[PDB]
Amino acid sequence: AMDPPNYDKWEMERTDITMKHKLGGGQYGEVYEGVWKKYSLTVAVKTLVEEFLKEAAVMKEIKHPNLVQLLGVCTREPPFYIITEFMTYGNLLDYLRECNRQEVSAVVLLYMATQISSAMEYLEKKNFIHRDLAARNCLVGENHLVKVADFGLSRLGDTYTAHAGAKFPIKWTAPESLAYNKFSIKSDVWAFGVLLWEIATYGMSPYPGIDLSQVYELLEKDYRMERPEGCPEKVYELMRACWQWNPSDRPSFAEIHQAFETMFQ
Numbered sequence: 415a416m417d418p419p420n421y422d423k424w425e426m427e428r429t430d431i432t433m434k435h436k437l438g439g440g441q442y443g444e445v446y447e448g449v450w451k452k453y454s455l456t457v458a459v460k461t462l463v464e465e466f467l468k469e470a471a472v473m474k475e476i477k478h479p480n481l482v483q484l485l486g487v488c489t490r491e492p493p494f495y496i497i498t499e500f501m502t503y504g505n506l507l508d509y510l511r512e513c514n515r516q517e518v519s520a521v522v523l524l525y526m527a528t529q530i531s532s533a534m535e536y537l538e539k540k541n542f543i544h545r546d547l548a549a550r551n552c553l554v555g556e557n558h559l560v561k562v563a564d565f566g567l568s569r570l571g572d573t574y575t576a577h578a579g580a581k582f583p584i585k586w587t588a589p590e591s592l593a594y595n596k597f598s599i600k601s602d603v604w605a606f607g608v609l610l611w612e613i614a615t616y617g618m619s620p621y622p623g624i625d626l627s628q629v630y631e632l633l634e635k636d637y638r639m640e641r642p643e644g645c646p647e648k649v650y651e652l653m654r655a656c657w658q659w660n661p662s663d664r665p666s667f668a669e670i671h672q673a674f675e676t677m678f679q
């Protein structure tokens with residue numbers, strides 16, 4: 415930590431953190447479990463350049479109860495660290511697959527959807543684009559608390575597939591993103607509808623068995639995924655709204671969050 419001369423309040427003493435093993439069996443790349451000794455606090459620590467420093471810069475501009483919280487950075491000297499909170503129950507997709515379904519009931523699914531749409535309303539308000547919203551990019555803490563993250567998973571199976579030295583998760587990717595490389599808050603809104611279907615099925619893969627090279631074709635012919643067992647009609651209506659072909663026809667996250675709020679009470 416710096417003395418208030420290029421001061422950055424986020425810079426911390428690398429030595430304050432005890433680095434343990436790679437997190438989640440190595441599924442996150444160079445991310446480690448850590449203890450910030452002086453707070454007795456378990457943390458997540460991503461390590462390694464422009465991309466990495468641009469990510470740290472972005473995280474300093476964002477703060478929301480449902481976005482994973484940046485705690486500090488070590489970016490003076492290598493090896494560079496970005497340090498965030500550690501969320502006890504791990505990524506949402508695995509959580510939903512593994513959970514006690516009597517505990518994670520219909521109302522809990524509603525609560526998860528609602529928290530995520532909150533985070534996305536805040537990114538929408540700040541003019542940020544997520545670009546890879548999916549259950550695999552969300553984290554679960556105590557009492558069903560859910561936060562949106564971005565683990566940079568595209569180069570870490572067939573979830574992502576190549577597009578010009580880019581890899582895209584086709585089944586979460588809006589039609590104008592597939593066809594024109596156009597990303598916006600409205601392509602996040604499309605991805606959010608897919609996320610809602612993940613939550614509604616307790617973590618099933620979307621478009622089951624559908625070959626990736628026929629996805630665009632099908633969507634252009636108005637095919638959409640069917641309503642999951644037990645999913646309220648109103649929630650399915652929101653999903654279908656998120657999957658409107660023209661991005662301008664899709665609701666805002668402000669609208670979506672308000673719709674879930676109304677339901678969640």
Ligand SMILES: Cc1ccc(NC(=O)c2ccc(CN3CCN(C)CC3)cc2)cc1Nc1nccc(-c2cccnc2)n1
Pocket residue numbers: 437438442445458459460469472473482496497498499500501502503504505542543544545553562563564565
């Ligand atoms: C250690 C770390 C470093 C960086 C990040 N970064 C982000 O999560 C993030 C979130 C949002 C943005 C916003 N950004 C807007 C612009 N578009 C293009 C991209 C997204 C950027 C980065 C998270 C983490 N946290 C993290 N990473 C991997 C795994 C875990 C983890 C695993 C299990 C239990 N608890 C925590 N925790």
Ligand SMILES: COC(=O)c1ccc(Cl)cc1N
Pocket residue numbers: 520521523524525527610611613614644645646649
């Ligand atoms: C009561 O709300 C629900 O049942 C519910 C809400 C969100 C999702 Cl994604 C699925 C559900 N099944």
Ligand SMILES: [Cl-]
Pocket residue numbers: 423
């Ligand atoms: Cl300051």
Ligand SMILES: [Cl-]
Pocket residue numbers: 438503504505
């Ligand atoms: Cl995890």
Ligand SMILES: [Cl-]
Pocket residue numbers: 541542543544
């Ligand atoms: Cl952005």
Ligand SMILES: [Cl-]
Pocket residue numbers: 500501502503554555556
């Ligand atoms: Cl937690």
